[PDB]
Amino acid sequence: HMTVRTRVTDLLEIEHPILMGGMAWAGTPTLAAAVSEAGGLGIIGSGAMKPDDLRKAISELRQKTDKPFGVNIILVSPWADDLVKVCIEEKVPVVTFGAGNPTKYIRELKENGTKVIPVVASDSLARMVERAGADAVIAEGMESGGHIGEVTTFVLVNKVSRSVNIPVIAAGGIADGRGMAAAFALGAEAVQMGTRFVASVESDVHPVYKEKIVKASIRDTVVTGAKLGHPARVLRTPFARKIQEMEFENPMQAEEMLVGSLRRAVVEGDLERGSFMVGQSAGLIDEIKPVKQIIEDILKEFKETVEKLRGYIE
Amino acid sequence: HMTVRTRVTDLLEIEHPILMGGMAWAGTPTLAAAVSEAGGLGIIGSGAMKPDDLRKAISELRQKTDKPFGVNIILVSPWADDLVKVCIEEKVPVVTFGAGNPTKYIRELKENGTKVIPVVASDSLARMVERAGADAVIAEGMESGGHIGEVTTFVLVNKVSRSVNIPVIAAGGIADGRGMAAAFALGAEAVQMGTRFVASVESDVHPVYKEKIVKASIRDTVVTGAKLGHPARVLRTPFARKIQEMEFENPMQAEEMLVGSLRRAVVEGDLERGSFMVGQSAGLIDEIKPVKQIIEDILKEFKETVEKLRGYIE
Secondary structure, three states: OOOOOOHHHHHHOOOOOEEEOOOOOOOOHHHHHHHHHOOOEEEEEOOOOOHHHHHHHHHHHHOOOOOOEEEEEEOOOOOHHHHHHHHHHOOOOEEEEEOOOOHHHHHHHHHOOOEEEEEEOOHHHHHHHHHOOOOOEEEEOOOOOEEOOOOOHHHHHHHHHHHOOOOEEEEOOOOOHHHHHHHHHHOOOEEEEOHHHHOEOOOOOOHHHHHHHHHOOOOOEEEEOOOOOOOEEEEOOHHHHHHHHHHHHOHHHHHHHHOOHHHHHHOOOOOOOOOOEOOHHHHHOOOOEOHHHHHHHHHHHHHHHHHHHHHHOO | OOOOOOHHHHHHOOOOOEEEOOOOOOOOHHHHHHHHHHOOEEEEEOOOOOHHHHHHHHHHHHOOOOOOEEEEEEOOOOOHHHHHHHHHHOOOOEEEEEOOOOHHHHHHHHHOOOEEEEEEOOHHHHHHHHHOOOOOEEEEOOOOOEEOOOOOHHHHHHHHHHHOOOOEEEEOOOOOHHHHHHHHHHOOOEEEEOHHHHOEOOOOOOHHHHHHHHHOOOOOEEEEOOOOOOOEEEEOOHHHHHHHHHHHHOHHHHHHHHOOHHHHHHHHOOOOOOOOEOOHHHHHOOOOEOHHHHHHHHHHHHHHHHHHHHHHOO
16 A cells, blocks of 8 residues: 655654654553554554553553553653653654653663653744654644644744654644644644544544534633643533633632533533544544544555645646 | 745736735725835725825836735725725726625726735635635735734634635735745635735834834734724834723723824834734744845745645645
8 A cells, every 4th residue: 555654764663654642641552552453653642641551551552452552641741750761661663742842751762772752832942853863753733632832833833843853743723634744744743632532433432522622613722721721622512612711810710610520521522511622623524533543544545645746846 | 935826826918926905094006016016916095095006106106016916905994985086087997895895896807907806814705705706815814903803813814715716815824934834734726815915114104103113022912992893003112002991991992003103103103103004923023125026035935835745745
């Protein structure tokens, strides 16, 4: 089939330049294993985990697949240090980081053979982690679901690719091969998707979450928590709208009702109380397919898109 | 040189698939004339104009160039009707519209031989204006400077392209050939730039405006007026930050100091009191060049980008 070789496929020793996004609750071992088996890089989201949970998670994944995989670590977690140690001890091939500067850990992880891929939303952070020894970076645009920065993918991927020599991985707004083509045009050498993979048959999120992604238009997301210092892109529900109003009228009250809301969405499909992290890519997703098919479709459309672009330079 | 033919170049009868954005104050006859002369489509921004002004502007532009050009009309202007009649009377080749649904005017303009290209930020509006007889549409992502919608370029251009058969022109985040390549991969057949052309030697905006575009990073913009119903992306100045904090603390006071602010920026370079419409593309712009060179650079890099993409499907 149409397989694309990039510096990221070489670096990670995987078949396809497609990574799964680090997601708390949704980023389970079953989903990660599926993406890794399909030839991409599955990622376990440790966001919501204690060290024993992560270790149980890594073990479950390995009972499902021999292929490479990664773990996402949220730096603002109070278990961050211990989670990094679990990864070194379990010899996890790739480790990605969110919510901060992971310079602190790069050297130890690297000396143990781990590939380190920070998630960044600024040209600055990209440069710093490159100097600190990062193997690659994930430039995540604000159209992405979950916690977001302030720069769109179109601009960010461009700027970051120009600024660093290490490969850049595009994240935010990519749900098909047109998107991969575009990401690559901007300078990326791999893509990362979250929403698209939650919208898979292997994803074990609650059905209502899948239903909402499918039925969502490109305009059915809103940003909550901007005023609380942790802006997040979520499905536009009447609850999301109340949180928005609330974070001005009573910030404490808003912080309160966000507590446990990510889990209520992912595990309980609770529309009246949950936070459904969803990128704007939701509006480019109309069905639920198996992970293997999603990848094949993206690679096929990528080849087609590059071919029609060839048409203009004749 | 490397010139690219698209349905948009045929439709508009111009050499290059590059349009200048409609901008109040910045979108002057001189800059439009320069873009049209360079082979793209210059656009006069009627935003801040009375019918007599538009007529004088059309005349000036014609004393500068024989090539095709357009006029941007803001629907929420009280002179909208009269502005449309000026365009019909002066046989303006292309008319673009912003800030609403221009269905009302499409048939009259079309019967007079004018090409109508609405600016949209939603898939819905795109479909409607297509059914109403629009020749093309401009999908404007929220990374764009000035008044913005809520969907990023990466996602919007993809969805709109898929939904309508008429050509789509990508706007927002495009300041180079990588961008044009990416835009085209997403489905567009032309691009529109604002910031990039304000950052030209022919642009007659105040020098401080140009200096700021050049010195601005991809993160130096903020959105003011979200709560006032007219969200606009501006340079992140202390004044912009005050207006933000103020539209919640005292909405009517905010509305008051925004009055006359766009002109104070463009004409007087007033940093303490002006609103500098600026896309996130500002951070991808590091110098001021002539319009003719911007276009050549974009076309050269577009060719190079497509060729590099060819490398992956080998």
